[PDB]
Design a protein around this ligand. Structure first.
Ligand SMILES: C#CCCCn1cnc(N)c2nc(Sc3ccc(C)cc3C)nc1-2
Length: 208
């Protein structure tokens, strides 16, 4: 069963701005997603100190970057805390409302899109390079879910019967036709070195 939801109007507006604004420095999307993965890993690590059983779903804390030219996808995988159904449907978007308002005010005052992460809404920068984003996620004590959106004001959530992932999040970027440079090994390596060189978890760049 696939459920369809409307984004909050403010989030739809943010996504439209990201898609419509002329802005060449698109590569910053990767730093934003890696940053989110790092935060998710920090969270499960912290929680595990008081409840060690939270790592029964996997002790390894890391990030994988997986390009696939045949599917035209770049996947950012982490073994962090994951997300609940409520996270996906309501709670992350609700929190994102304040950051969105502040971000759009800052842009009018002279800020640029690269600063999106300073407002806590960096996830949506995925739409700089992706025509569709699929998020597969598994949180302890909740089921595995697939969230998906091609923007246009709506997203879907379903229980995922695909390959079980243990715990964490996979952000699958279905790249725009003119953004296939982000499938190239040399390009991803360059971006990770430029913007994500001090992340406190292993980042493995898979090759094709
Ligand atoms: C980190 C932190 C913990 C919070 C949950 N969470 C966990 N792991 C990730 N890799 C996340 N990326 C986001 S941004 C985001 C915002 C909205 C939607 C719908 C999806 C995502 C992935 N949120 C994430």
């Amino acid at each position: 069963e696939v459920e369809t939801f409307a984004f909050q109007a403010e989030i739809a507006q943010l996504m439209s701005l990201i898609i419509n604004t002329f802005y060449s420095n698109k590569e910053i999307f990767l730093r934003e997603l890696i940053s989110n993965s790092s935060d998710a890993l920090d969270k499960i690590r912290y929680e595990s100190l008081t409840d060690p059983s939270k790592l029964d779903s996997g002790k390894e804390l890391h990030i994988n970057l997986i390009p696939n030219k045949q599917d035209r996808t770049l996947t950012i995988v982490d073994t962090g805390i994951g997300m609940t159904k409520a996270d996906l449907i309501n709670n992350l978007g609700t929190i994102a409302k304040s950051g969105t308002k502040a971000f759009m005010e800052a842009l009018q005052a002279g800020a640029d899109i690269s600063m999106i992460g300073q407002f806590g809404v960096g996830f949506y920068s995925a739409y700089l390079v992706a025509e569709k984003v699929t998020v597969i996620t598994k949180h302890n004590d909740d089921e595995q879910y697939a969230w998906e959106s091609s923007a246009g004001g709506s997203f879907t959530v379903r229980t995922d019967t695909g390959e079980p992932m243990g715990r964490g999040t996979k952000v699958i970027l279905h790249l725009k036709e003119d953004q296939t440079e982000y499938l190239e090994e040399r390009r991803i390596k360059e971006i990770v070195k430029k913007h994500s060189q001090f992340i406190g978890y292993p980042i493995t760049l898979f090759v094709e």
